[PDB]
Each structure stands twice: as structure tokens, then as C-alpha cells.
Amino acid sequence: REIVHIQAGQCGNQIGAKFWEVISDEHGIDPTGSYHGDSDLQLERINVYYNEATGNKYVPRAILVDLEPGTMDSVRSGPFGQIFRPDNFVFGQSGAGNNWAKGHYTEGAELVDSVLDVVRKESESCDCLQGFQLTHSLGGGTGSGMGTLLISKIREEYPDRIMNTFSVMPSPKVSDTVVEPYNATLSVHQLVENTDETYCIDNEALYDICFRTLKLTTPTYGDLNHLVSATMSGVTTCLRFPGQLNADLRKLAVNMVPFPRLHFFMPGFAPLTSRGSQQYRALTVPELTQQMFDSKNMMAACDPRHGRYLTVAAIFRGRMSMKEVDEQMLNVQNKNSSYFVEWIPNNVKTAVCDIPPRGLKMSATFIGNSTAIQELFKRISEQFTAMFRRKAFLHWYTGEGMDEMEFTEAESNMNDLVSEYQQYQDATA
Amino acid sequence: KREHEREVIQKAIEENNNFIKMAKEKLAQKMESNKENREAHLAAMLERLQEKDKHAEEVRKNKELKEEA
Numbered sequence: 150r151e152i153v154h155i156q157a158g159q160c161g162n163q164i165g166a167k168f169w170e171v172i173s174d175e176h177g178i179d180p181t182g183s184y185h186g187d188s189d190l191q192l193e194r195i196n197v198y199y200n201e202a203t204g205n206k207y208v209p210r211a212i213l214v215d216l217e218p219g220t221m222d223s224v225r226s227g228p229f230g231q232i233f234r235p236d237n238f239v240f241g242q243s244g245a246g247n248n249w250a251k252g253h254y255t256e257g258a259e260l261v262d263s264v265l266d267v268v269r270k271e272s273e274s275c276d277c278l279q280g281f282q283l284t285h286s287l288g289g290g291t292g293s294g295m296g297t298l299l300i301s302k303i304r305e306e307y308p309d310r311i312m313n314t315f316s317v318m319p320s321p322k323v324s325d326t327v328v329e330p331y332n333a334t335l336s337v338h339q340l341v342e343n344t345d346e347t348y349c350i351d352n353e354a355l356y357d358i359c360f361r362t363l364k365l366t367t368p369t370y371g372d373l374n375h376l377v378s379a380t381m382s383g384v385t386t387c388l389r390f391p392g393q394l395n396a397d398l399r400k401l402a403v404n405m406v407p408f409p410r411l412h413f414f415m416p417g418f419a420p421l422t423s424r425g426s427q428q429y430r431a432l433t434v435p436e437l438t439q440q441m442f443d444s445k446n447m448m449a450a451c452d453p454r455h456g457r458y459l460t461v462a463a464i465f466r467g468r469m470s471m472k473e474v475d476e477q478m479l480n481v482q483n484k485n486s487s488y489f490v491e492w493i494p495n496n497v498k499t500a501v502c503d504i505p506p507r508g509l510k511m512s513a514t515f516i517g518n519s520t521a522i523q524e525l526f527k528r529i530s531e532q533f534t535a536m537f538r539r540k541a542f543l544h545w546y547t548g549e550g551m552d553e554m555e556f557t558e559a560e561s562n563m564n565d566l567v568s569e570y571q572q573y574q575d576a577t578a
Numbered sequence: 579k580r581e582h583e584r585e586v587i588q589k590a591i592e593e594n595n596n597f598i599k600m601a602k603e604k605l606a607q608k609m610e611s612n613k614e615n616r617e618a619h620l621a622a623m624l625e626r627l628q629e630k631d632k633h634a635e636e637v638r639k640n641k642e643l644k645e646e647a
């Protein structure tokens with residue numbers, strides 16, 4: 150039932166805020182936490198993400214963390230910034246300097262217990278807490294280093310709850326900072342061991358979509374983040390709205406993750422169409438379905454045609470006949486059955502929800518668990534070793550007390566993870 | 579993991595303490611050597627000047643000895 154949400158660092162707080170902004174609009178909540186909705190379908194499951202305060206006020210079950218105040222003020226002074234519980238702001242002053250070691254071991258060490266206190270206070274207010282969700286980037290210092298420290302501490306207090314993260318991978322196409330492959334590799338190591346489900350949101354993929362597909366010549370984080378919030382709303386539809394699915398996070402993990410370490414998901418969203426003459430066409434289910442599976446629509450920069458899907462979850466939203474959706478989804482599998490492993494029968498599932506996202510008559514959200522995600526970890530691995538071969542920029546991390554061995558076993562873990570994906574790409578029945 | 583997290587933070591504290599400690603000690607020992615070295619250079623030069631004052635007075639005694647003949 151209840152989910153506790155944590156956003157850490159600049160990126161995590163940025164996309165975390167847009168997420169609450171978007172789903173608040175869907176559930177008919179205004180920026181002061183009052184309900185102004187029509188359908189009651191919007192309150193059926195409102196308690197999943199919102200706490201009910203005195204006076205018919207719904208407040209997000211959200212914890213906001215950062216090692217510097219800047220983004221705290223930014224969120225607090227924005228649209229839907231007043232909706233958040235004021236106790237649930239936990240920030241420092243030092244900042245992490247895009248340094249994983251500062252977030253994970255030195256500066257974050259002091260703030261971490263304050264966060265666990267708010268986490269603990271929210272968990273005890275839950276009827277039956279099902280688990281946690283974290284938004285953060287892997288390329289920085291706070292969301293990457295301190296976000297993973299939070300995951301580790303939270304898992305130790307709630308060892309049987311589901312742990313789920315929306316994790317933004319770094320790309321040289323978007324960001325300037327040379328040490329990002331270092332931060333990401335240390336983070337991936339923590340994620341393979343302490344999360345149950347991780348959505349891989351690749352800034353490299355988000356950039357190609359905005360630049361190539363959407364024709365945005367000067368992409369901003371606001372553009373990228375509006376893709377992320379749309380996808381985050383889509384993948385959480387079946388938690389926040391009733392209908393045909395009696396599903397929570399654990400059931401999703403059980404049916405999406407056939408092997409413990411292989412829990413990194415490839416997300417996608419339809420529709421995506423550049424401005425503007427095509428923005429007025431009516432979307433048909435056949436078109437939604439082809440777009441959803443198109444490699445160029447994927448939100449992790451990896452070619453799904455290079456590998457195989459272990460499992461797929463697809464969710465459609467809006468007014469549409471389920472018969473059309475059924476036929477179309479079966480068409481994709483029957484006509485391209487070599488891209489789905491045959492040792493997992495009937496391994497693509499569909500859910501349809503009546504309420505559509507704001508601004509769209511229809512939409513589809515894609516959750517793919519594909520062996521091709523290895524391309525993402527290979528890319529980060531290449532950048533890592535090019536630098537680590539010569540111990541370049543290592544002093545920023547050893548000056549915080551870290552050893553070289555810790556880097557060696559992080560790259561080691563990621564290389565094995567790559568190997569594991571490769572072995573089911575060639576596994577046959 | 580928790581033992582290691584304390585390990586790392588305590589190692590950061592120790593490397594910073596050792597940095598301060600060595601700078602402190604290197605500086606202290608350099609001020610010390612320079613004091614000794616400069617004071618010795620001056621003592622040498624002054625010891626030499628007095629050795630000349632000694633010779634002058636001997637030049638005066640020498641004048642009177644020949645002065646009695």
C-alpha cells in the first residue's frame with residue numbers, strides 16, 4: 150500500500166519535484182494540498198503516495214535530501230513547493246563537489262542520521278508499508294554517493310521491503326565533469342547489491358530524443374526532466390489507480406526479475422513527436438505500439454535489437470479498446486519473436502488504465518528487461534578504465550580516505566554484471 | 579559496510595592530521611637551523627674582527643718596547 154519517496158541531490162530533487170507536480174495534477178491535488186478533482190477513481194489509491202492530514206489535506210510522503218541548500222530553496226519556491234511537509238527537508242551546507250566519496254563517506258556521514266529519522270517517522274505512519282523509491286543521479290556526489298549510503302542504511306532497518314530507484318546515468322553529451330564515470334561506477338556497484346528494481350534513465354538517451362527526434366536545438370534540463378516525469382507517471386500508474394491489476398511493487402519485482410542481479414529496467418514512453426504539424430494528428434493503437442518498441446524510443450541508450458528481452462511490462466492509458474491493444478501487442482511478439490527469449494513463456498504483459506496523462510488522449514509506457522542494457526554499462530566502463538588505467542583524478546577520492554581497491558572491485562562487479570547479461574543473450578532452449 | 583564507513587572517515591581524519599603535523603615539524607626545524615646558521619655566521623665574522631683588535635694592541639705594546647732604546 151504505502152510507499153515512502155526519497156529524492157537526493159540536485160538531479161534527484163529536480164526530477165522528484167516534477168514527479169510530484171505531475172501526479173498531483175493527475176490526482177486532482179492543487180499546490181496547497183486540497184483535493185479539487187472530479188472522479189473518485191483520483192482518491193481510490195491516493196494513500197499510496199500521500200499522507201492524509203487534518204482538514205482534507207493530502208501531503209506527499211516525500212523526503213527531500215541534499216548536502217547544499219541551493220536546490221532546497223529552488224524546490225521550496227516553485228510550483229507545488231508549498232505542498233511538501235516542512236519537517237521533511239534535510240539539507241547541509243558543505244556540498245559534495247560532485248565527489249562520490251564526500252557524499253558516501255565524509256560529508257554525508259553527518260547528515261545521514263537526520264534523514265533516517267524522517268524516514269523512520271514516515272514509515273511508522275503507514276498502514277502497511279510496501280517499500281521505498283529514490284530519485285537521484287549517478288554522476289554527481291550527493292545523489293550518487295549519499296543516495297547509495299541511504300539505500301544501504303534503509304535496507305538494514307527494513308530488510309524485507311522493496312527498494313526501487315529511478316537512477317539517471319551520466320553522459321558526456323550532457324555534462325562537462327570529468328569524474329562522472331567514477332561516481333557512476335561506484336554507484337552501480339551499490340545498486341546491484343542493494344536495490345530490487347532500478348529504472349535506468351540515461352541522459353545520453355534523453356539527449357538523443359530531444360535533439361534528434363524532438364528537434365530541440367538547445368535542450369535544457371527542463372526538457373529532459375519533462376520526459377522523465379512522463380515516464381515516471383506511466384510506470385507508477387498501476388500503483389495509483391485501480392483496475393484489472395491487483396499489483397504492487399513486490400509482484401512487479403517477482404515477475405520482472407528472473408535473476409537477482411538482473412534488475413535494471415529499460416524504460417520508454419509514447420507518444421514522442423516533434424513540433425508541431427504532427428502534434429495534432431490522432432494517435433492509433435497500432436502507432437503507439439510500434440513507437441513503444443522502437444529502439445530509438447528507448448530511454449537507455451542501448452539497441453534492444455542487439456539483444457533479447459527477458460521480461461516486458463507495457464501500460465496503456467486512455468480511452469481505447471482492449472481488443473485492439475491485445476492484437477497489436479501479440480502482433481509485435483509473433484512477428485518479432487526472436488527478440489524475446491523462449492525459455493520464459495508469455496513474457497510480455499499488458500495493463501490498461503482508463504485515466505490518460507494530462508495533455509494526451511492516449512499514451513503507452515514501456516518497461517523492458519533486456520540483455521542489451523549491457524551496452525550502457527560497457528559505455529560507462531570504457532570511460533572508467535581509460536581514466537583509472539593511469540589513476541587520473543584519483544586524488545580527489547583518496548583525499549577523502551578511499552582506497553584504490555574500492556575502485557577495482559567496483560569496476561570488477563560491473564564487468565561481471567556485463568558478463569551475466571551476455572550469457573542469457575546466447576542462452577537457448 | 580558500517581565498519582568500513584568508519585574506517586574511511588577515520589583515515590581521512592588521519593591523513594589530514596599527518597599533513598598538519600609534518601608541515602608543523604618541517605617548519606619548526608627550518609626556523610631552528612636558520613637561527614643557528616645565521617648566528618654562527620655572525621659569530622664567525624665578529625670573532626675575526628676581535629682577532630684584529632688583539633693584533634692592534636699587540637702593535638701598541640710592540641711600539642713601546644722599541645721605545646726604550
Ligand SMILES: CC[C@]1(O)C[C@@H]2CN(CCc3c([nH]c4ccccc34)[C@@](C(=O)OC)(c3cc4c(cc3OC)N(C)[C@H]3[C@@](O)(C(=O)OC)[C@H](OC(C)=O)[C@]5(CC)C=CCN6CC[C@]43[C@@H]65)C2)C1
Pocket residue numbers: 321322323324325360366367368369370373
Ligand atoms: C540538457 C542540459 C544541457 O542544457 C545540455 C547541453 C549542455 N549543458 C548546458 C547548456 C549548453 C549547451 N552548449 C553550451 C555551450 C556553452 C554553455 C552552455 C551550453 C548545449 C547546447 O548547445 O544547447 C543548449 C550542448 C552542449 C553540448 C552538446 C550539445 C549541446 O546542445 C546541442 N554536445 C553534445 C556536447 C559536445 O561535447 C559534443 O560532443 O559535440 C556535439 C559539444 O561539443 C561541440 C563541439 O559541440 C560541447 C558544446 C559546447 C563542447 C564541449 C562541452 N560539451 C558538453 C556537452 C556538449 C558540449 C546543451 C546542459
Ligand SMILES: CC[C@@H](/C=C(/C)[C@@H]1C[C@@H](OC)C[C@H](O)C(C)(C)[C@@]2(O)O[C@@H](C[C@H](OC)[C@@H](O)C(=O)O1)C[C@@H](OC)[C@@H]2O)CO
Pocket residue numbers: 438439440442443444445453454481485488
Ligand atoms: C520489437 C523487437 C525489437 C526490434 C524490432 C524487430 C522492431 C520491430 C518493430 O518495432 C516497432 C518494428 C515495426 O515492425 C516496423 C517495421 C513496422 C517499424 O515500426 O519499424 C520502425 C523501425 C525500427 O527501428 C528501431 C525497427 O528497426 C525496430 O525497432 O523493429 C519504423 C518503421 O521501420 C520501417 C516501421 O514502421 C525492438 O523492441
Ligand SMILES: C/C(=C\c1csc(C)n1)[C@H]1C[C@H]2O[C@H]2CCC[C@@H](C)[C@H](O)[C@@H](C)C(=O)C(C)(C)[C@@H](O)CC(=O)O1
Pocket residue numbers: 363365372375376379418420421422423424425427428429430431432509
Ligand atoms: C510527443 C507528445 C505528444 C503527442 C504526440 S502525437 C500528439 C497528438 N501529441 C508529448 C510527449 C509527452 O511525454 C512528454 C515528453 C515531451 C517533451 C516536450 C515537452 C518537449 O520538450 C517539447 C519540445 C515538445 O515536444 C512539445 C512542447 C511540442 C510537446 O507538446 C510535444 C511532446 O513531445 O509532448
Ligand SMILES: Nc1nc2c(ncn2[C@@H]2O[C@H](COP(=O)(O)OP(=O)(O)O)[C@@H](O)[C@H]2O)c(=O)[nH]1
Pocket residue numbers: 157158159160161163164245246247248286287288289290291292293317318319320323324329352355370371373374
Ligand atoms: N536528467 C537530468 N540530469 C541532471 C539534472 N541535474 C543534474 N543532472 C545530471 O546529474 C549529474 C550530476 O549530479 P547532480 O545531481 O548535479 O549532483 P549532486 O547534487 O551531487 O547529486 C550529471 O550527469 C548531470 O547531467 C536534471 O535536472 N536532469
Ligand SMILES: [Mg+2]
Pocket residue numbers: 159289
Ligand atoms: Mg551540480
